[PDB]
């Protein structure tokens, strides 16, 4: 039969399951709702491990349990009482013999050791992947160090000593490919001549490669702590979501730079070369699976200042019109084709983050924190699982690095790009629209002519890579 459990009066996690404390979804069970005690019981269950549940719980628990209270609860979970000797053990002891202790030994092997090990696995995941709780609360860290450092007994010793070392390393805190990255490509601007770097003088292949490295690094830096609780939308967003906001502000600045390059090129023929070059960069973004970059370009082409430039669009070569149209169709029908393409490509890639943000926000806003059942309020865990499914998808695409070499000067050029200068947003985007009206006036105003501004050749070197020995 099943193992007997400690009395629920001395050990709270032995209370029987009921609809008043846990609800399952319709082959391990999936929890729809439960009390925090039942969630922690199942987080550290003696019958099975649930590593996805550990990630889901540690990512989302702060919406229903404070970090200090979580630590108290898992320490309480860890301290399991052992059963008393049975009648057969008693009779052996009364005869001076050693008891078999069959039930005690089974309870240690099949209940205490698995639960305790799974408590330690929660601690290990907490420290390794959610260390910000301890960075923000030094006393919480002290309590965790004390708990781990005072676990006795040889069965847990290997993991206790390991977790102690992991904590110490995390307090004071390399990529291998077997193929070489391709050679860095140069066009008009030559290596070290950063003062000539510009949209048309850097090689369009290398523009796309270095922006992809930059945008990949920015994408990979965003942690779930910046997302759960919708904190990037709230008043403290600069404090709680700095890596996400840096990533978005890069994307915005690049889009505005593309628009600015276009509408400040007043000569029609030169402006066609600028737009064609940007579409070539978009083609390389597509080849690199940099979907953020693809949409940076598409957003620029759909902006009010650029979208209305019919004379410019008319002269774009047909094959580039088709490249731009295909990229635009990724966003149609609520990103239907983008979502399918993201799920089909071979990473590395750079996802577009905005869809994730909308889905996290709407999941949090559209589902209640608790479910009321039989007079009790149960934590709505299904809502947290949905949020963690999104943060898990984000994290899955953060693992794979790009096999591309950094060019430090080109990287710095794009890190320092500042198309708006000291201007506020409205002043700047009104400027861009007024430039658009200047260079291609509204009908029936005639189209003026403008002098050339570039002294170097406008012919693109193309976007197929070269390879000398």
């Amino acid at each position: 039969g099943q193992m007997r459990l400690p009395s629920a009066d001395v050990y709270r996690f032995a209370e029987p399951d009921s609809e008043e404390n846990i609800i399952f979804e319709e082959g391990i069970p999936i929890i729809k709702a439960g009390t925090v005690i039942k969630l922690i019981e199942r987080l550290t269950y003696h019958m099975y491990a649930d590593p996805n549940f550990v990630r889901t719980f540690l990512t989302t628990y702060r919406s229903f349990c404070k970090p200090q209270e979580l630590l108290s609860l898992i320490i309480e979970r860890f301290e399991i009482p052992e059963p008393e000797p049975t009648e057969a053990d008693r009779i052996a002891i009364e005869n001076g013999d050693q008891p078999l202790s069959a039930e005690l030994k089974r309870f240690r092997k099949e209940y205490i050791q698995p639960v305790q090990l799974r408590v330690l696995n929660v601690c290990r995941h907490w420290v390794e992947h959610h260390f910000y709780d301890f960075e923000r609360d030094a006393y919480l860290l002290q309590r965790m160090e004390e708990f781990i450092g005072t676990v006795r007994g040889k069965a847990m010793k290997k993991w206790v000593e390991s977790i102690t070392k992991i904590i110490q390393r995390k307090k004071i805190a390399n990529i291998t490919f077997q193929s070489s990255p391709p050679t860095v490509e140069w066009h008009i601007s030559r290596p070290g001549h950063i003062e000539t770097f510009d949209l048309l003088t850097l090689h369009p292949i290398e523009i796309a490669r270095q922006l992809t490295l930059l945008e990949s690094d920015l994408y990979r830096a965003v942690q779930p702590s910046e997302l759960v609780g919708s904190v990037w939308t709230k008043e403290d967003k600069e404090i709680n979501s700095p890596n996400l906001l840096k990533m978005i502000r890069h994307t915005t600045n690049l889009t505005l730079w593309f628009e600015k390059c276009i509408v400040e090129t007043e000569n029609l023929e030169e402006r066609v070369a600028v737009v064609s070059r940007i579409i070539e960069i978009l083609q390389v973004f597509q080849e690199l699976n940099n979907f953020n970059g693809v949409l940076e370009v598409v957003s620029a082409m759909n902006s009010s200042p650029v979208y209305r430039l019919d004379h410019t669009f008319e002269q774009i070569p047909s094959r580039q019109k088709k490249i731009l149209e295909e990229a635009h169709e990724l966003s149609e029908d609520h990103y239907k084709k983008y979502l399918a393409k993201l799920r089909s490509i071979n990473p590395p890639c750079v996802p577009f983050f905005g869809i994730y943000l909308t889905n996290i926000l709407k999941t949090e806003e559209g589902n209640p924190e608790v479910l009321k059942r039989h007079g009790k309020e149960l934590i709505n865990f299904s809502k947290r699982r949905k949020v963690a499914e999104i943060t898990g998808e984000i994290q899955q695409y953060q693992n794979q690095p790009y096999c591309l070499r950094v060019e430090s000067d080109i990287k710095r050029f794009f890190e320092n790009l500042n198309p708006m200068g000291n201007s506020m947003e409205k002043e700047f985007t009104d400027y861009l629209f007024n430039k658009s009206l200047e260079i291609e006036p509204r009908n029936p105003k005639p189209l003026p002519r403008f002098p050339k501004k570039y002294s170097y050749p406008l012919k693109s070197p193309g976007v197929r890579p070269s390879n000398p020995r």
Binding site: T255, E259, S299, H334, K336, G354, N359, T363
Partner: protein
């Protein structure tokens, strides 16, 4: 077959804007939602006896992607311009949202409604008279909605569809 209206929700972030479409599209009577579900933003409705399909774009959460607003806005035939009645800044933002919609659509007469949203129990700071005066100055309807009781939600969307039909 039936007419499809492409509606776009615009307005300041962080003040409960997303509750408007969630409460509309929702199972009205079960507070639950999966936004990842294909067509969680499409709803067949009957307005003045005529059946139509609403396709609602609400990019709530993407407000910092400010250079994408033009692209998102151009997809729409009618617009809900949403502010929170306890956030004066979000009300002051309305003028620039409307100007941007007019530019993107290249029209001075774009179907739109002004929506004042009650997203919590914090003190109201925009009185309804202020918002009515603003809507009248623009020639557009004003609807107030609750983010919690679903009051006003149908009226906001149906009024906008009537603005499209009567354009």
């Amino acid at each position: 077959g039936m007419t499809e209206y492409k509606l776009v929700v615009v307005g300041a972030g962080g003040v409960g804007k997303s509750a408007l479409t969630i409460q509309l599209i929702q199972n009205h009577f079960v507070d639950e939602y999966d936004p990842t579900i294909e067509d969680s933003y499409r709803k067949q409705v009957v307005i003045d006896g005529e059946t139509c399909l609403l396709d609602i774009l609400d990019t709530a959460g993407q407000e910092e992607y400010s250079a994408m607003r033009d692209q998102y806005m151009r997809t729409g035939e009618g617009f809900l311009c949403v502010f929170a009645i306890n956030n004066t800044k979000s009300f002051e933002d309305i003028h620039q949202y409307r100007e941007q919609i007019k530019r993107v659509k290249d029209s001075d007469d774009v179907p739109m409604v002004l929506v004042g949203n009650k997203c919590d129990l914090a003190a109201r700071t925009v009185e309804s008279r202020q918002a009515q005066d603003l809507a009248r100055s623009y020639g557009i309807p004003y609807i107030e909605t609750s983010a919690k009781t679903r009051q006003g939600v149908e009226d906001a969307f149906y009024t906008l569809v009537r603005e499209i039909r009567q354009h």
